[PDB]
Amino acid sequence: QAATVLDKPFEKPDLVLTDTQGKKYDLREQTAGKPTLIYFGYTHCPDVAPLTMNNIAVAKKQLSQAEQDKLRVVFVSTDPERDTPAALGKWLKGIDPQIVGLTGEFDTIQAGARTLGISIDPPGTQVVAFSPKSDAGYVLYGEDATVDDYTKDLPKLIKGENP
Template structure:
C-alpha cells in the first residue's frame, strides 16, 4: 500500500520565529518510514547537536488527560524540568514509533538522577482512538515513565499551532485505517525558563539524543 504523507505548514509568527526552511513530514496510515525532513541550521556555538531555535517558544498552556485518566496541566506538571514534547498518534506506522523509540533508547543511557530531570511528553493527535489505556500500553514499550496525554483535539491543535506545528483532523480511509497529519518536530524546553530552545526533526539519529539529553538534564543553555 502506498504511503500517505503530507507536508504540514508552519503558521503565523511561529514560522518566522523558527528562521529556518522546514519541510515537515507527517505520519500516514501505512508506509516504510522513508519520509524526509530538512532544515537549514544556523552555525553557532551551541553545545547541542539539535537545532537551536531563534525564538524560544513558551510551553503551551494545555490541560488534557494523562494515561492514568487524571487531569494533566502541561505547564504546571512539567514546570522546572527539561521537557521533550512531541505530537503524534499510536497507530502511526513510521515517524511516531521511530522518534519515541529513539528517545527511549537515549533515555536509557542516562543515570537515574538524569532521567528524573527530564519529562518526555507525547500528545495524541488522534484522541478518539488513543485512550489513556491505549497510550500507556504503546508508550511502555519505549519508556515506562513517558507521559502520554489525550483529550480535546481542538486544544491539541491550538497548542501545536503556538509552536509552529500544524495538525489536521484524523481521516478514516476506505480500508478502515486512519491518517493523522502532523508535524514531525520534537521540541526541547529548558528547566530554567520552561521555554523551547532546541528543535529535533523527524529522522534525528539516536546519537544526537544521546549527546543532548545529558545537557538538557543539566539545564545547559543553548
C-alpha cells in the same frame, strides 16, 4: 547539527489534558522546572511516532536513573478517538514507562501545537525541548534527528544548555 537552537524560545503551551491514568494533567504545572521534550503524534503510526519515541528512549536509557527521573518526555496524541488514556498508556509502556501520554480534544491539541510552529491535521519541527531554567522551548528537532543525536544532546538538554 540536528538541533535548531532558537534565539527566541517558545512558551510552553498551556495544555490541560488527560494523562494515561485518566487524570487531569496541567502541562505547565506538572513539568515546571523540568527538562521536557514534547512530541505530537499517534500510536497507530507505524513509523515516525514509534521511531521518535524509541530514539528518545534509547538516548534516555544511557543516563543515570537520577538524571532520567528529571526528564519529562511527553507524547501528546493527535488521534484521541483511538488513543484513549489507557490505550496510549499501554502503547507507551512498551517503549518506556516514564513517558507521559496526554490525550484530549483535537482542537485544543492542534492549537497548542501551532504555538510551537507545528502543523497537525487529523490522521517540520517534530520535537521541542523545554529548558528547566526557563520552561521555554529552546531547541527544535526534526524527523532527521537520530538516536545518536538525542544520545549526544540529552545531557545538555537536561541542564538547559545549548547542544
